[model samples]
Target: MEPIIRIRNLHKWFGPLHVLKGIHLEVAPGEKLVIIGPSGSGKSTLIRTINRLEDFQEGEVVVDGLSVKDDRALREIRREVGMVFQQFNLFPHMTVLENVTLAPMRVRRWPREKAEKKALELLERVGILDQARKYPAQLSGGQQQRVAIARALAMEPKIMLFDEPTSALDPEMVGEVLDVMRDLAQGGMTMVVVTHEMGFAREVADRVVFMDGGQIVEEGRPEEIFTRPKEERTRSFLQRVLH
Candidate 1:
């Protein structure tokens, strides 16, 4: 079978600074991949490119069976890609249920009853169904992030992109989000995550990609990459984050 996601010769630059340099990667269906790198190493940039939140200057992003070169096609492709952000990115003024249902009702054009049912199911999956009436500002960082996860899953995506999904939360609030991710992983959802959470990488990642200086320096099974990395950069990064 063809890969579910394929990126070919991806290059993105901001004037003189190159963020993604000739990236070539493919992800099979239901595979969970975790990306780790030092600050400024472009992991977040690469993840955002998957959903077209960040446009690349040159290269192609293919999702499912469609390439994201045309705006109309990109819209359709996005419907299959769900994303959870580090900042949560929930609208502070909207209640959790409203936030979760808005995109499906507006973009997917699901009927009100259908959207509400789907949204509630997702919220329950994330263990936040009781808080559906709460605004983002009224919840803790972890709660808000779970709501964001629910909102994304409500779209019924084939693949999920998580951009440092737990990084911005306080230490105490990170576990809930990670737990939801672990559940998703066990269910075999195709996931590409940009994060430094070593525990989650060990528990959930089928492969771990280590990037540096805008390039993927090394990649392997999480155990190998964490225990015996080939690249010096990868080794040093692991040392810093682990010890």
Candidate 2:
């Protein structure tokens, strides 16, 4: 079967900084792939390029058999992929329901009432339906992030990208956010997550990717990556993250 996402010899750079080096990967439908690495390792860049949030200097990125280099393809691919950033990039002025409904109404041309209904369904799915009328400032960090997730899902994306989704939250709030992500994975969502939460990686990832110096060092089943990584860099990185 064709992969849902495929990258071959992918390379990306920012002026003098070469962030991605010859990356080749494939993600199957409904697969949960977790990425782990030290800071500045290009994990986030890799996923961003998959959805065209960032452009590459060399190689190819194909989603659903369409190359990301094409503008139309990029738009279509983005419609199928959802992203949640470390910071809950919510519109502070908009109520939770409004925030979630905006994109569907705008991009998908959904009717206002229809959009609000779907927004409510997604908010309920993420355990934040009651906060629908509240603004971002009125909710806790976890609640805001959940709203962000609901907003993304309002598009009915086929794949979800999480860039350290829990990193900005307080210790007490992290679990609530992770709980929602866990439910997503268990419910058979295709997800590519860049996160430092090893426990979450171990429990939910079908495949684990370890990166260093802007390249993939090792990738395997979560148990293998966690307990018996093949590369020296992978082992060293895991030692630090595990301890």
Candidate 3:
């Protein structure tokens, strides 16, 4: 299958610091790709560029057949590419159901009844429907994140981008969120995740990407990237993150 998202020779900089250096990536339909590296390796910056939250200075960034060179591309890309952040970026004042229904009703212009039905289905799919009537502040970190996921799902995105989705959760909550992600993977969702969880990478990711100093140093099957990395930079970064 053709890639749903593709990044070719991508480059980005913040002030004098070049955060993304000629990055290249591709995500095909139903593929699960994970990115892992040290703190300043540019994994977060790279993902943000996909949805146009961050702009690039050079190279091609395409999503669902749309090239993100301007606002026109951004509008088309965001509708197909849904992102989940480390911090659950939800409206604290809105009830879970409202949060989930807002985007579909507003952006897609679905009827209120249709949007509500879609929201409830997603809330239940993400295991957060029980709390749909409550505000985000009333839920645990995991529950809030699930609500965040449900909100994204209600948009019916073609590709899911997870930026360390479980990194901020408690240890007990991490498993719950991962379980939801695992279910999504089993259901053949196209997923690209940036995370540091080595164990989760081993079990869930079809391929693992390693980066250091804003470059993708090595990429391979999960076992290969974790156990037998080819580049010195990848090895050093993994040792630091894992040990």
Candidate 4:
């Protein structure tokens, strides 16, 4: 199958300092690409680039055959890309059910019951159906995070972008969120995850990408990258995290 997400000679900058320097990568349809790196490394930027959340200065981002630079293409891309961020990004004022159902009604133009049904289905799938009436503040970090995931899945996105989703969760609760993600992967949801969870990376990733200093330093199958990384930077970063 052709790649669903493709980046070619990608480059990005924040005024003077460059954040992404000539990066190249591809994520095939239904493939799980788990990106790992130290904080402030390029992993976060790379993930954001796929959804065009962080615009690139040079190179192309092609997702599902549409170039990211096109306005029309972006409108369609926005609906297809589901982003789960470091902060859960749930509105404090909105109820859990409302938060999940809002997009399907507004963006997809589904009827209330249809949108609500999808939201409920996803919320239950993510293990937070009981908290449907609660606001963001009422739930634990893990629960709020799952609500965010449910909201995205309600749109039925073709691809999911997760940026350090489990970082804010308690150790016990982290597994719950990770389990939901693993379940998603099992169901063939194409995913690009920028995370520090090595165990999940090793277990769920079809390809393990090590990005550093605004470049993809190394990449390979999970077993190969975790067991025997090729580059010194890859080895160094993995050592700092794994030890």
Candidate 5:
């Protein structure tokens, strides 16, 4: 299959500091890929470029044959890629059902009837049907994140990007979010996750990409990247994080 996402020699700068440097990558349909690295290493920035959450100075990100560099394609690209942030980012003022239906109704221009149907289905699938009428602030951290997942899935995106989805949760709540993601993986949703959760990556990631200093230092099967990393940077990163 052709690449669903193709990123070529990408570069991003924050004033004097270079953030993403010559980064290149491709993600295939239905692939589950993990990006792991220390904070400020461009892990979040790289994925953000995919959905145009951030802009890069050089290189290009093409999604489903459309270039992210093309301003006209941004709305289309956003519909194709779904992202879940570390904070769950739900609209606190809205009921969970309203939060999930907002995009499908407005962006996709579906009827409110169609939107409500879709939101209920997703809320049920994500185990939040009982809380649909409740607001985000009333839910626990795990429940809110699941609502965020349902909201993203309500748009019916072709790919999902998880930006530290589990990082904000309490220890007891982490597994619930990962389980939702694991089930999504089993259902064959293409996912690009930026997380330091090695355990989650070990179970679901088809490829574990290690980034350092704004570049993918190395990538491979989770087992190989975790146990037999070839780059000194990868080895040292694993040493620091996996303890």
Candidate 6:
């Protein structure tokens, strides 16, 4: 089967500083890939390019057979690839249910009743149906993030991109968000997650990609990459992060 996401020779730069350099990666249907890297290493930039949030100057990104070069293709790709950012990105004034249902009703042209039904189902799936009527400010960080996840899934995306979904949460709240992601991984949702949670990587990632200096230094199964990385940089990074 063809991969759901295929990126070839991907390169991006901000002024003179290169953020992503010659990136080549692929994601298969239902495959979970976790990306790990230190700050400024371009992990977030890489995923942003996948959904066209960040445009690349070189190479190609193709999602579910749609190329990123064309604006029309990007519109369709965004519909198919759901994104959850480090910040919840929820509209502060909108209730959780309204937030979740807005895109489906507007972009998908779903009727109000149909959109609300689907939104409720997604909110329930993320274990936050009871909070649907609450505004984002009324909920805890974890609950807001869960609502964000539900909002993303409301579009029925084929691939999910999580850009440090748990990063901004309080330490205690991180687990709840991670738990939702764990369930999604187990349920065979195709995902690309940029995270530092090694436990999550070990438990759910089919492959872990370690990156540095705007390039993928090493990538392999979690056990292999965690226990016995081949490159010196990978080993050094693990020591700093794991210790």
TM-score of each: 0.96, 0.97, 0.95, 0.96, 0.96, 0.97
Q: Which residues of candidate 4, in runs, are more than 4 Å off?
A: none
Q: Tens digits of per-residue lDDT for model 1 on 1-243?
A: 689999999999977999999999899999999999999888899988888788898988888878776788888877899999988888988899999999999998999899999989989999988999889888999999998898888888999999998888899998888999999999768999988789899779999999999999999998999999899999999999997
lDDT of each: 0.90, 0.92, 0.87, 0.90, 0.91, 0.92
Q: Per-residue lDDT of 93-112 in model 3, one digit per residue for the tens?
A: 88889988998888999998
**Pairs with backbone N, CA or C atoms under 3 Å apart (clashes), candidate 2:** none
- What's the distance in Å from true for residue 73, model 5? 0.7
Range of the 10 consecutive residues with the lowest summed lDDT in candidate 6: 69-78
Write one digit per residue (lDDT tens) for candidate 4, span 165-219: 9987888889899999999878788999999899899999999988888888899
What's the C-alpha lDDT at position 233 in model 6?
A: 92
lDDT of 2: 0.92
Residue-level lDDT tens digits of model 6 in 26-69: 99998999999899999999999888888889998988999977
**lDDT computed for candidate 1:** 0.90
Better of 3 and 5 by TM-score: 5
Per-residue lDDT of model 5, residues 36-143, tens digit only: 998888999998888888888999889999998899998898788899998888888999999999999999999999999989998888888999989988999999
Task: State the lDDT of candidate 2 residue by residue for 105-215, as single tens digits.
Answer: 989999999999999998998898899999999999999999999999899998999999999889998999999999999866789999989999999999999999899
Best prediction by TM-score: 6
Q: What is the Å distance of residue 1 in model 3 from its true position?
A: 2.2
Error of 4 at 155 (Å): 0.3
Model 5 weakest 10-residue run by lDDT: 181-190
Q: Which stretches of candidate 1 lie over 4 Å from their true place?
A: none
Off by over 4 Å in 6: none
For every candidate in turn, the CA RMSD to the true structure comes to 1.2, 1.1, 1.4, 1.1, 1.2, 1.0
Considering only N, C-alpha and C atoms within 3 Å, which residue pairs clash in candidate 1?
none
Location of the lowest summed lDDT over 10 successive residues in candidate 1: 65-74
